[PDB]
């Protein structure tokens, strides 16, 4: 009995939370009460199966159990609809139908959070319900969230409410903490979102390589066989999580932590404190842990990978292990290299041996492989230093606007809200990365940009509009950033006529958070660039300043939104001209 097994290992509290997540990610439109009903029914059934593994139905697949349980609700169509596709299917075509229907941008209310007293009132009232509702809302808005890590979020959320609904000042306590969690939430969601796209669109060989690269950077004293074994396990975990199998994913993640913590000596000397932690922190910790120190004596690659004969024989005899090995060996030596870079290098090596070992003088044409690495290392470095340079003059917000123009120019067809979200997360690289010394700049930055471009890739995927986005997103995961880089303003694109709509604002702008005000400015800038990509000196900065000044005047005009509408016909015309 699999469900009974997943009960025992996980315990009831984590069991229930995981189950709930699974339902809200499968059916994001569904109200809270229905999923709760479904969870308790599943827990109730699972308990009997721990009571007797021969009890009727306990032998069935988690998929069948969850699917059946789901279909008692999904079939109601003019309310749901296309999940009544899936309900008329049988396993395993149904599970895939559920997965294939995940929505990275579902038309759901953005959650405004109410005032603190009320929130604290809700927590003390029934704190189990409050937590469940927290999971419910995040999971359905992020159907690919690293489900085990979402438990950890819930844990810290609960700790914020337990502490903060006790002090002198509720809001001063809690609101900062909820913000730090909303910040990490977004990043964590996007991090996992890329892992699932590696697996789903490029297959496990691609993921495995990514893994070897990254774990070798992290665990460089560890031998290749130890790395391979962690890599097999890490992949099994993510493969399960990206596929909706949350239960096994949590269970296999705990096991992976047990394993790692018992073998610290073969692995890294930084695990000390992660391994002292409780179950959830423990995994979270490991995943976040800084690189171990490099083995001080390390021999040059050349001996076994260029100078040697048997290069071609090893290549052919065992290509996957030989290539893993190159990548491990080169990875452990360059924690100052982004993972996308190192996989780029390793693809370059392969292709070279490919063509070279097609024997005329193999030992010759592949003698200068490392020669091809030169340009590949330099392209990122220059862009990183340069964009960090541009950021220092500008700061985060002004750095965001520059990107906004850059990428809207690049791919003008992409929805406005998408551009704004993407460019702002793109600008957030400067804050996270340029702070660092060059030792840490490139991984930080180019790896971060993978995450953010992958966001643009999936958001755009839902309703495709620009052939250059689709092309860069399909082409090759490893190449995505360069692909977007090499792109320049679009000639094909027929500039947008013009809207009075899109440049008249309303008096609600005078009371918005600095955050929301930025987003509104940016939204208008995109729309601007969309109207005039070809032409765009400083003439954009003139227009944006003409907007900001009408906004200064109109927010101090104190009337009933009148100059927003009066000066709102005035200036719409004026900006097409200037």
Q: Which residues bind ligand GLC (CB under 6 A)?
A: 234, 253, 256-257, 283, 286-287
531 annotated as belonging to a binding site for a ligand = no
CB nearer to ligand GLC: pick between 151 and 256 = 256
Contacts of residue 273, defined as CB under 8 A and 6 or more positions apart, other chains included, come to: 285
Nearer to ligand GLC, 239 or 352 (CB): 239
Residue 101 counted as an annotated binding residue: no
Q: How far is the CB of 257 from ligand GLC (least distance, A)?
A: 5
Return the sign of the alpha-carbon dihedral for residues 100, 32, 191, 6.
negative
How far apart are the two ends of the chain, measured CA to CA in Å?
A: 71
Identify which of residues 257 and 524 has a Cβ nearer to ligand GLC in the complex. 257
Residue whose C-alpha is closest to residue 334's, from 306, 367, 376, 365: 376
- Closest CB 20 distance from ligand GLC, rounded Å: 20
How far is it, in rounded angstroms, from Cα 535 to Cα 130? Answer: 52
HEC string of 484-505 equals HHHCCCCCCCCCCCCCCHHHCC
**Structural contact between residues 58 and 4, judged by C-beta atoms closer than 8 angstroms:** yes
HSE of 9, CA atoms in CB hemisphere, 13 A: 17
d(CA 176, CA 160): 10
Q: Is 251 one of the annotated binding-site residues?
A: yes
Q: In terms of CB distance, is 281 or 350 closer to ligand GLC? A: 281
Q: How far is CA 574 from CA 541, 568, 578, in A?
A: 14, 10, 6
Q: What is the spatial distance between Cα 137 and Cα 455, in angstroms, rounded to a whole number?
A: 20
Known binding residue 243? Answer is yes
Q: Does the annotation list 255 as a binding residue?
A: yes
d(Cα 174, Cα 188) in Å, to the nearest integer?
A: 21
- State the chain's maximal CA–CA distance in angstroms: 84
> Whose Cβ is closer to ligand GLC: residue 257's or residue 420's?
257
How far is residue 246 CA from its own chain's centroid? 18
Q: Taking the complex as a whole, how short is the minimal distance between the CB of residue 405 and ligand GLC, in angstroms? A: 35
350 annotated to bind ligand:
no
**H helices, E strands: number in the chain:** 27, 0
- Report the residue numbers after which the chain has a gap, meaning the C atom sits over 2.5 angstroms from the next written residue's N, or none: none
SS3 267: coil
Alpha-carbon distance of 469 to 248, in angstroms, equals: 35
Q: How near is the Cβ of 290 to ligand GLC at its closest, in Å?
A: 13
- Note whether 29 and 80 are within 8 A (CB): yes
Q: Is 265 annotated as a binding residue?
A: no
558 marked among binding-site residues: no
Shortest separation between residue 80's beta carbon and ligand GLC, angstroms = 32
Q: State the DSSP code for 166.
A: T
Q: How far is the CB of 256 from ligand GLC (least distance, A)?
A: 5
What is the C-alpha to C-alpha distance for residues 172 and 180, in angstroms, rounded to an integer?
13
DSSP letter string, 320-357? HHHHHHHHHHHHHH-TTS-HHHHHHHHHHHHHHHHHHT
Alpha carbons 35 and 73: distance in angstroms, whole number: 9
545 has binding-site annotation: no
Please, which residue, 62 or 287, has the CB nearer to ligand GLC?
A: 287
CB of 287 to ligand GLC, least distance (A): 4
245 marked ligand binding residue? yes
Q: Which is nearer to ligand GLC, 39 or 285 (CB)?
A: 285
- Say if CB 75 and CB 87 are below 8 A apart: yes
**Least distance in Å: CB of 461 to ligand GLC?**
23
CB of 528 to ligand GLC, least distance (A): 40
CA-CA distance, 532 to 425, in Å (whole number)?
A: 24
- In whole angstroms, the minimum distance from the beta carbon of 403 to ligand GLC comes to 28
> In angstroms, what is the minimal distance from the CB of 358 to ligand GLC?
37
The residue at minimum Cβ distance from ligand GLC is 287
Nearer to ligand GLC, 60 or 236 (CB): 236
Nearer to ligand GLC, 59 or 262 (CB): 262
C-alpha torsion sign, points 159, 160, 163, 166: negative
Contact 295, 333 (CB under 8 A): no
| Closer residue to ligand GLC, CB minimum distance, 287 or 478 | 287
Choose between 135 and 285: whose C-beta lies nearer to ligand GLC. Answer: 285
For the annotated binding site for (4Z,15Z)-bilirubin IXalpha, the residues are 236
For the annotated binding site for Zn(2+), the residues are 63, 243, 245
For the annotated binding site, the residues are 2, 9, 63, 236, 240, 243, 245, 248, 251, 255
């Amino acid at each position: 009995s699999e469900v009974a097994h997943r009960f025992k290992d996980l315990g009831e509290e984590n069991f229930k939370a995981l189950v709930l997540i699974a339902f809200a990610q499968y059916l994001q439109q569904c109200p809270f009460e229905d999923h709760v009903k479904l969870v308790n029914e599943v827990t109730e059934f699972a308990k009997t199966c721990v009571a007797d593994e021969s009890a009727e139905n306990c032998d069935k697949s988690l998929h069948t159990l969850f699917g059946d349980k789901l279909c008692t609700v999904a079939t109601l169509r003019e309310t749901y609809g296309e999940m009544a596709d899936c309900c008329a299917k049988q396993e395993p075509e149904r599970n895939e139908c559920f997965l294939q229907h995940k929505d990275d941008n579902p038309n759901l209310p953005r959650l405004v959070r109410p005032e603190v007293d009320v929130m604290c009132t809700a927590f003390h009232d029934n704190e189990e319900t409050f937590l469940k509702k927290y999971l419910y809302e995040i999971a359905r808005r992020h159907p690919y969230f690293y489900a085990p890590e979402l438990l950890f979020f819930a844990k810290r959320y609960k700790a914020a409410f337990t502490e903060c609904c006790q002090a002198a000042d509720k809001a001063a306590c809690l609101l900062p903490k909820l913000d730090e969690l909303r910040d990490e939430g977004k990043a964590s969601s996007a991090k996992q979102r890329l892992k699932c796209a590696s697996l789903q669109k490029f297959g496990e060989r691609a993921f495995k390589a990514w893994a070897v690269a990254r774990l070798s950077q992290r665990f460089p004293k560890a031998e290749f066989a130890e790395v391979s074994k962690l890599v097999t396990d890490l992949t099994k975990v993510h493969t399960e999580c990206c596929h909706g199998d949350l239960l096994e994913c949590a269970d296999d993640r705990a096991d992976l932590a047990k394993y790692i913590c018992e073998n610290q000596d073969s692995i890294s000397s930084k695990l000390k404190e992660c391994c002292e932690k409780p179950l959830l922190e423990k995994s979270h910790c490991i995943a976040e842990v800084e690189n171990d120190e490099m083995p001080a004596d390390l021999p040059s690659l050349a001996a076994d990978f260029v100078e040697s004969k048997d290069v071609c024989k090893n290549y052919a005899e065992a290509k996957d292990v030989f290539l893993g090995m190159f990548l491990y060996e080169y990875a452990r030596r360059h924690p100052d290299y982004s993972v996308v870079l190192l996989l780029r290098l390793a693809k370059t090596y392969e292709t070279t041996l490919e063509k070279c070992c097609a024997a005329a003088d193999p030992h010759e044409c592949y003698a200068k492989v490392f020669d091809e690495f030169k340009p590949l290392v330099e392209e990122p470095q220059n862009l990183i230093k340069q964009n960090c340079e541009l950021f220092e003059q500008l700061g985060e917000y002004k750095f965001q606007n520059a990107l906004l123009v850059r990428y809207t120019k690049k791919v003008p067809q992409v929805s406005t809200p998408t551009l704004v979200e993407v460019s702002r997360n793109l600008g957030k690289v400067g804050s996270k990365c340029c702070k660092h010394p060059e030792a840490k700049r490139m991984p930080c930055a180019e790896d971060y940009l993978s995450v953010v471009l992958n966001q643009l890739c999936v958001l755009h995927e839902k309703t495709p509009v620009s052939d250059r986005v689709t092309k860069c997103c399909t082409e090759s995961l490893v190449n995505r950033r360069p692909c977007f880089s090499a792109l320049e303003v679009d000639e094909t694109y027929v500039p947008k006529e013009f809207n009075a709509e899109t440049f008249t604002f309303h008096a609600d702008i005078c009371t918005l958070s600095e955050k929301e005000r930025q987003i509104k400015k940016q939204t208008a800038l995109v729309e601007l660039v969309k109207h005039k990509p070809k032409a765009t000196k400083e003439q954009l900065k003139a227009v944006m300043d003409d907007f900001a000044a009408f906004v200064e005047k109109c927010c101090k005009a104190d009337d009933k939104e009148t100059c927003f509408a009066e000066e709102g016909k005035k200036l719409v015309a004026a900006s097409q001209a200037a």
